[PDB]
């Protein structure tokens, strides 16, 4: 029993973290097989980030300008190229600690673990979610760029996020491992406002199921609702509209607990309209939306990873 915000074990990713330095700028890179992936703004000075022309800046860089250090060992760079907003540094040595891995572009509402790193060294691991407005709410100080987000399925690490930017509002933006930003953001120090931070309804419901499974049940009520009726309430409270696809994904949790998805929606409706009256659910005083239905099933059954 008990339910915690839980990150994936980070060892497989720790073995892939390297330091990348170009000129006066040092951030983190990801070493997989014989390629190191890092944010392209490693080639920028602080002044460059106001309006960088990355293709022109990269013309002034050669392979030997990219200093790559894996712990104490220096890696030899034998090629470099830019793919969207990431650089791919080809090195002459395959990472012997390369895990089975994939690159995946995640959807808003999906969760992943972040291994915060500085100077190529891991600092901590935590869980977060791709917000509907394509930001993440992380913990990143200067030097953390190139830290990555990931999911693990048994023995395969699916890399989904590379950190690039902090918005002036303190939220975070980054890319997939193909270098494409999530959302409209760009690797330029400019005005970039985030859209509405909408709540991930299907994740709140999954978390309510997790609560019931663990004995927090005070919020269950005698009511039901419909998708269209619930969504009128979701709109009022800046929740994502619930779809039948979401209802289907919650099916296993509905089956396990015997609480129909729409009955749980009616519990959520009352919590939105009335608040939590000074009480808590799973140690939280607000509705938590960074557990997916798959996260809940995983933690409530005890799935492991090779």
Q: Which residues bind its own copies (CB under 8 A)?
A: 1-12, 14-15, 71, 115-119, 121-126, 128, 137-144, 166, 170-172, 214-215, 275, 278, 280, 283-286, 299-306
Residue 254: name its binding partner from its own copies, Zn ion, none (Cβ under 5 to 8 Å by kind).
Answer: none
* Residue 266: CB minimum distance to Zn ion, A: 38
Q: From the CB of 149, what's the least distance to its own copies, in Å? A: 12
Nearer to its own copies, 61 or 298 (CB): 298
User: Backbone phi, then psi, for 113, in 5-degree steps?
Assistant: -95, 145
Residue 44 near which of its own copies, Zn ion, none (CB within 5-8 Å, type-dependent): none
> Cβ of residue 75: shortest distance to its own copies, in angstroms?
18
Annotated catalytic residue, options 41, 163, 164, 172: 41
Instruction: Copy the structure tokens of residue 100.
Output: 């089975």
Residue 96 interface partner, choices Zn ion, its own copies, none, CB cut-off 5-8 Å depending on type: none
Size of the chain, expressed as the number of residues it contains: 306
Nearest distance from residue 244's CB to Zn ion, in Å? 41
Catalytic residue status for 41: yes
Q: Which residue bears the tokens 């002036």?
A: 168
Say which entry of Zn ion, its own copies, none residue 116 contacts (CB below 5 to 8 A, set by partner kind): its own copies
DSSP β-bridge partners for residue 235: none
User: What are the CA-CA distances from residue 217 to residues 90, 113, 209 (Å)?
Assistant: 54, 28, 9
Q: Which partner, Zn ion, its own copies, none, binds residue 4 by CB below 5 to 8 Å per kind? A: its own copies
Q: Are 151 and 142 in contact (CB under 8 A)?
A: no
Burial annotation 20-53 (CB, 10 A radius, 16+ → b, else e)? bbbbebbbbbbbbebbbbbbbbbbbeeebeeebe
> In the complex with Zn ion, which residue's Cβ is closer, 145 or 234?
145
Structure tokens at 107: 């959807």
Half-sphere exposure of 244 (CA within 13 A, CB side): 0
CB of 17 to its own copies, least distance (A): 9
The conformational region for residue 203 under phi > 0 = left, psi -120 to 50 = alpha, else beta, is alpha
Q: How far is the CB of 137 from its own copies (least distance, A)?
A: 6
Quote the CA–CA distance of 185 and 110 in Å, as a whole number.
19
Closest to its own copies by CB, 140 vs 181, is: 140
- Residue nearest Zn ion by beta-carbon distance: 145
Q: Please, what is the Cα angle at 236 between 171 and 221, to 5 degrees? A: 105
Q: What is the rounded distance in angstroms from the CA atom of residue 94 to the CA atom of residue 293?
A: 37
Angle at the Cα of 299 from the Cα atoms of 294 and 303, rounded to 5 degrees: 85
CB closer to its own copies, 43 vs 117: 117
3-class SS of residue 218:
coil
Residues that bind Zn ion (CB under 5 A): 145
101 vs 261 by CB, closer to its own copies: 101
Residue pointed to by tokens 């494409």: 180
- Catalytic residue, from 145, 172, 246, 265: name it: 145
Return the one option of its own copies, Zn ion, none that residue 145 interacts with (CB less than 5 to 8 A, by type): Zn ion
Q: Which is nearer to its own copies, 196 or 244 (CB)?
A: 196
For residue 187, the SS3 value is coil
List residues with catalytic annotation.
Answer: 41, 145
């Amino acid at each position: 029993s008990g339910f915690r915000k839980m990150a994936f074990p980070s060892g497989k990713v720790e073995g892939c973290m390297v330091q990348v330095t170009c000129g006066t700028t040092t951030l983190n890179g990801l070493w997989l097989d014989d390629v190191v992936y890092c944010p392209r703004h490693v080639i920028c000075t602080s002044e460059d980030m106001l309006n960088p022309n990355y293709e022109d800046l990269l013309i002034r860089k050669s392979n030997h300008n990219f200093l790559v250090q894996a712990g104490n060992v220096q890696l030899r760079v034998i090629g470099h190229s830019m793919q969207n907003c990431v650089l791919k540094l080809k090195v002459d040595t395959a990472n012997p600690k390369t895990p089975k891995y994939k690159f995946v572009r995640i959807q808003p509402g999906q969760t992943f673990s972040v291994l915060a790193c500085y100077n190529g060294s891991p600092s901590g691991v935590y869980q977060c979610a791709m917000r509907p407005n394509f930001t993440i709410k992380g913990s990143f100080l200067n030097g953390s760029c190139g830290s990555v987000g990931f999911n693990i399925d048994y023995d395969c690490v699916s890399f989904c996020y590379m950190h690039h930017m902090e918005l002036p509002t303190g939220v975070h933006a980054g890319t997939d491992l193909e270098g494409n930003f999530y959302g409209p953001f760009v690797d330029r120090q400019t005005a970039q406002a985030a859209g509405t931070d909408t709540t991930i309804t299907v994740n709140v419901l999954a978390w309510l199921y997790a609560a019931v499974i663990n004995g927090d049940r005070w919020f269950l009520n005698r009511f039901t609702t419909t998708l269209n009726d619930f969504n009128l309430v979701a709109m009022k409270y800046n929740y994502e509209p619930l779809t039948q696809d979401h209802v289907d994904i919650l099916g296993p949790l509905s089956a396990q607990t015997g609480i129909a998805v729409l009955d749980m929606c009616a519990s959520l409706k009352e919590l939105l309209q009335n608040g939590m009256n000074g009480r808590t659910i799973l140690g939280s005083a607000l509705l938590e939306d960074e557990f997916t239905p798959f996260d809940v099933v995983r933690q409530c059954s005890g799935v492991t990873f090779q």
